[PDB]
Design a protein around this ligand. Structure first.
Ligand SMILES: NC(=O)C1=CN([C@@H]2O[C@H](COP(=O)(O)OP(=O)(O)OC[C@H]3O[C@@H](n4cnc5c(N)ncnc54)[C@H](OP(=O)(O)O)[C@@H]3O)[C@@H](O)[C@H]2O)C=CC1
Ligand SMILES: NC(=O)C1=CN([C@@H]2O[C@H](COP(=O)(O)OP(=O)(O)OC[C@H]3O[C@@H](n4cnc5c(N)ncnc54)[C@H](OP(=O)(O)O)[C@@H]3O)[C@@H](O)[C@H]2O)C=CC1
Lengths: 240, 242
């Protein structure tokens, strides 16, 4: 993949404040993208923004949207503020996500559970709905959901996370079918990656023996770039 | 498939008991000897189904109210305590209750309707399953059945919240299926298109006499609550292969 793969492409990334979303941003940016950052923490996004600026020379915008509490109006309002500065979106990476409770179904807490489906499904549904006009105004728009392997096959103790990655996958498949030959619409399964969500989940696992968000990026770029134009409605594993 | 003493002295709770496919499961289970618990949100609809199952079997079911759009974790724990009082287990639970919501472009889906659908179909069904898992554990071969749709396995245009909710349902089932291996049977049914009112809402033009009725598709519904399926778990089954 050439260093100018994403020149003059407008790419928005959620959960840009930390982890995979952080790394996706910086990288899309190094590949020449106009990146847009979303998160819920102004102080964290300022730092990401700052670091990308020191990296590439361009200061990316960040917008605030807490996905737990956000409504359709706020999301629609966020679309408004993005149209102010940008003619279109070429890519939207829905990367934000809440892990919630990792325990037996009998132990799973119902408020954390309703927080998980709020952030991973609803708020992500709502926000997609608002950004679709800007994605359609692009020459080949790319919408990406982040799944997980419990989004394909429920294992014990994954609970609310899992149900919500299943929903992410069907949500992706409805959309891809509706935007056939208008939009690329896909899922990425990152697989286990050196982040603080992964570690919460696996206290004992050694993170240094994991691939970093950096290492898993070839797929993140491929799905935003011209070589995936013909691909839609699929779930790609960053680590097959 | 079966025989009329099959579900003899098995105790089965059916949500969405007051109409469509749950009404029929409840009615059908009871004619095969089951002691049925009817759940729904409409007292009169429920009164009627109970009365009808009485006049058919001579055993009158008990019915309970839970509005899965509005219930809290507490509301469901209470109910389960209520059940635990008259009842010494649950050999079976059919989560039939469902909300269709808007069938329309993802661009057009109402956000509140979207959230209503996930609440009935994923969260309340979650919270309800949770409150009843102890009683189910008390069965010798308890059966937990969810209801999916073919768009819970493969999203298609215009299914919005309901396709999302049914994937989340298959997902949910697989987790539970993983944690209760050799403890519970935990499967899904895909009914197929069935002559009910939810179906009609989605296919207003469809001639409903071209569909199978709830009663045409009951074998599977019956197969899964009895002993012929005892070692099978973690799977989605089609009531209409095709
Ligand atoms: N890391 C891994 O091994 C795997 C991760 N995934 C998925 O990858 C994606 C990224 O996860 P990862 O980078 O690992 O995790 P992190 O927890 O490190 O970061 C997740 C991002 O989501 C944001 N976020 C969480 N809740 C909200 C909210 N309510 N409003 C706005 N933003 C929110 C966080 O913001 P902030 O923290 O700044 O508040 C953060 O920016 C997620 O979809 C995750 O589910 C899938 C498989 C494996
Ligand atoms: N019919 C079909 O072609 C197919 C059906 N299905 C699934 O089969 C199941 C049965 O559907 P079907 O019989 O067709 O539908 P019906 O609409 O005719 O019945 C659905 C049942 O769920 C109950 N319900 C809805 N919302 C709530 C709520 N908030 N609280 C408590 N109960 C509620 C209804 O109660 P009430 O009447 O009292 O309001 C009703 O008893 C559903 O889960 C549906 O998803 C899946 C694929 C195909």
């Amino acid at each position: 993949p050439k260093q100018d793969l994403l020149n003059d492409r407008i790419i928005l990334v959620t959960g840009a404040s930390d982890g995979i979303g952080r790394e996706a941003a910086m990288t899309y940016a190094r590949y020449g993208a106009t990146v847009i950052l979303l998160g819920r923490n102004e102080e964290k996004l300022r730092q990401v923004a700052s670091h990308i600026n020191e990296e590439t020379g361009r200061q990316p915008q960040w917008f605030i949207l807490d996905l737990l509490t956000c409504t359709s109006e706020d999301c629609q309002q966020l679309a408004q503020r993005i149209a102010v500065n940008y003619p279109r979106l070429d890519g939207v990476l829905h990367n934000a996500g809440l892990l919630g409770d990792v325990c037996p179904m009998s132990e799973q807490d119902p408020q954390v559970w309703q927080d998980v489906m709020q952030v991973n499904v609803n708020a992500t549904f709502m926000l997609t709905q608002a950004l679709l006009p800007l994605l359609l105004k692009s020459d080949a728009g790319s919408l990406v959901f982040t799944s997980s392997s419990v989004g394909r096959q429920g294992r014990a103790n994954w609970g609310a996370y899992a149900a919500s990655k299943f929903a992410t996958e069907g949500m992706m498949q409805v959309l891809a079918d509706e935007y056939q030959q208008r939009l690329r619409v896909n899922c990425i399964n990152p697989g286990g990656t050196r982040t603080a969500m992964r570690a919460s989940a696996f206290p004992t696992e050694d993170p240094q023996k994991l691939k970093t968000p950096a290492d898993i990026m070839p797929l993140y770029l491929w799905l935003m770039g011209d070589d995936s134009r013909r691909k839609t409605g699929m779930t790609f594993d960053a680590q097959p």
